[PDB]
């Protein structure tokens, strides 16, 4: 009893008649490539991808962005062609190539990267870390404006926050230096959120530091809604993720609703939904920049809970499920003696009536 | 007589768990004389070529592309002689893992 294939069978295309006149890949590598391209297509039979969670598979993206920078294709192309002609022209360069001695000025590449395709890379790192999944729930924005955040570890020491990086809570005890490039007709809103580590509410987060009505690049000049509160993960749980969001706003927005007390050391008072907060001001605010970091419990955090929050300090474990044992049988057959220990309650003799 | 000793019992080579079943880590999913089913995700291969589950979960069978290990002469030769569009496919067994890896509990509040 045969069934009929649904759509195309994979190799049904090439001709079996006259195999000698067909070109082969005599390379293992070419094969590997062709195979990895075949492994990425949407087949009609049960596949690995299907069961193993491509994570929603195809998804139409609601995009709350800043509009992509408009640049002329042909002009750019010509300019790059010329630059590469120039660079290929020199004999010095070629000498540097053959003799295996050359270096790339990494600072300038980091510059060009930040200027060009950086936003997209930062984006997919954010998607990777599920920033968009816990913040806007469906929504992807491209970080058009680069956001430079740093902490002062000392007089000469500066600890940068790139997307995804690890930082110690000791470093983050103070509010960070924030830099980005805008002229001023501008108004911005900066936000620091702890995406997880809320104690009561799985779906909610903590606002650490919230600033508003920010003229230009001027950081301190904005009226602070929520005063800086240093990172406080809990001892057991590993690696909370903190997010710096940057919103370009048009009209000056005032919120007495979102304004918090000046000391504000209460946790119920900082409880936050980035989604909701954005829904409110959605018309004026468009999210522009993003930078975020990974952070795990360290010594200094102990001081927080006791000294600031007036709390005991919660500590967690990592608890694995108890191992699976089959129903115990009256006559375990052909089973090792140690069998009787798997169903043992606790190791201690118990003399019942004795 | 001329013919002798054809007599041996079956080996019960077969497929023990089937698509959609639940499994516990260490269950034998199949046992085979030659490779018929290849081990996929979370499925260990034994030295007798039998497939067993490395994780608690649900069994799934799947067709997938076959890219042999370059240390294997035979397979790389078979792959190397194919017409330029063709791709070897094979049948795999996976276990889609069920329980979460672990949980975080509150030990003590200091």
């Amino acid at each position: 009893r045969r069934a009929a294939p649904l759509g195309p069978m994979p190799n049904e295309d090439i001709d079996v008649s006259d195999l000698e006149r067909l070109k082969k890949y005599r390379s293992f590598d070419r094969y590997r490539r062709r195979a990895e391209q075949e492994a990425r297509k949407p087949h009609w039979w049960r596949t690995y991808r299907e069961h193993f969670g491509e994570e929603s598979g195809p998804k139409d993206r609601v995009d709350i962005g800043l509009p992509p920078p408009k640049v002329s294709r042909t002009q750019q192309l010509l300019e790059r062609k010329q630059a590469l002609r120039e660079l290929r022209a020199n004999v010095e360069e070629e000498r540097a190539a053959r003799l295996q001695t050359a270096r790339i000025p990494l600072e300038a590449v980091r510059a060009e990267w930040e200027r060009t395709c950086g936003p997209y890379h930062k984006q997919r790192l954010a998607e990777y870390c599920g920033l968009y999944r816990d913040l806007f729930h469906g929504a992807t924005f491209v970080p058009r404006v680069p956001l430079h955040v740093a902490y002062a570890v000392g007089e000469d020491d500066l600890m940068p926050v790139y997307h995804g990086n690890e930082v110690t809570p000791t470093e983050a005890a103070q509010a960070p230096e924030v830099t980005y490039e805008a002229d001023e007709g501008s108004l911005w809103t900066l936000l620091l959120t702890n995406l997880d580590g809320h104690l009561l509410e799985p779906d909610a987060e903590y606002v650490h530091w919230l600033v508003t009505n920010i003229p230009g690049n001027r950081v301190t000049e904005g009226q602070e809604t929520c005063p800086y509160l240093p990172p406080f993960p809990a001892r057991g749980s590993g690696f909370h993720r903190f997010a710096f969001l940057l919103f370009k706003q048009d009209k000056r927005i005032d919120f007495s609703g979102d304004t918090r007390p000046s000391p504000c050391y209460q946790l119920a008072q900082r409880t936050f939904h980035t989604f909701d907060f954005y829904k409110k001001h959605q018309d004026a605010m468009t999210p522009a920049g993003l930078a975020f970091f990974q952070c795990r419990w360290d010594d200094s955090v102990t001081r927080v809970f006791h000294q600031l929050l007036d709390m005991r300090e919660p500590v967690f474990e990592f608890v694995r499920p108890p191992p699976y044992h089959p129903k115990q049988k009256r006559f375990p057959h052909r089973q090792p003696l140690r069998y009787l220990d798997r169903y043992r309650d606790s190791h201690e003799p118990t003399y019942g009536i004795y | 007589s001329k013919n002798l000793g054809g007599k041996s019992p079956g080996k019960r080579f077969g497929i023990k768990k089937m698509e959609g079943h639940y499994v516990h880590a260490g269950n034998i999913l199949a046992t085979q004389r030659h490779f018929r089913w290849h081990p996929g995700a979370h499925v260990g291969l034994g030295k007798n070529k039998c497939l067993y589950a490395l994780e608690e979960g649900v069994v799934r069978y799947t067709k997938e592309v076959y890219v042999p290990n370059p240390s294997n002469s035979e397979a790389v030769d078979l792959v190397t002689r194919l017409p330029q569009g063709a791709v070897l496919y094979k049948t795999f067994v996976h276990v889609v893992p069920a329980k979460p890896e672990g949980t975080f509990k509150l030990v003590a509040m200091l």
């Binding site: 009893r1 045969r2 069934a3 009929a4 294939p5 649904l6 069978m9 994979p10 190799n11 090439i14 079996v16 195999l19 039979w45 | 067709k63 076959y66 078979l78 002689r81 194919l82 017409p83 063709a86 070897l88 496919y89 094979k90 049948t91």
Partner: peptide
């Protein structure tokens, strides 16, 4: 499996002639 639509997906030997 003979009953299924996906039968003979792994079928190769007709592509390479070694005899």
């Amino acid at each position: 499996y003979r009953s299924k639509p996906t039968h003979g997906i792994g079928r190769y030997k007709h592509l390479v002639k070694a005899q």
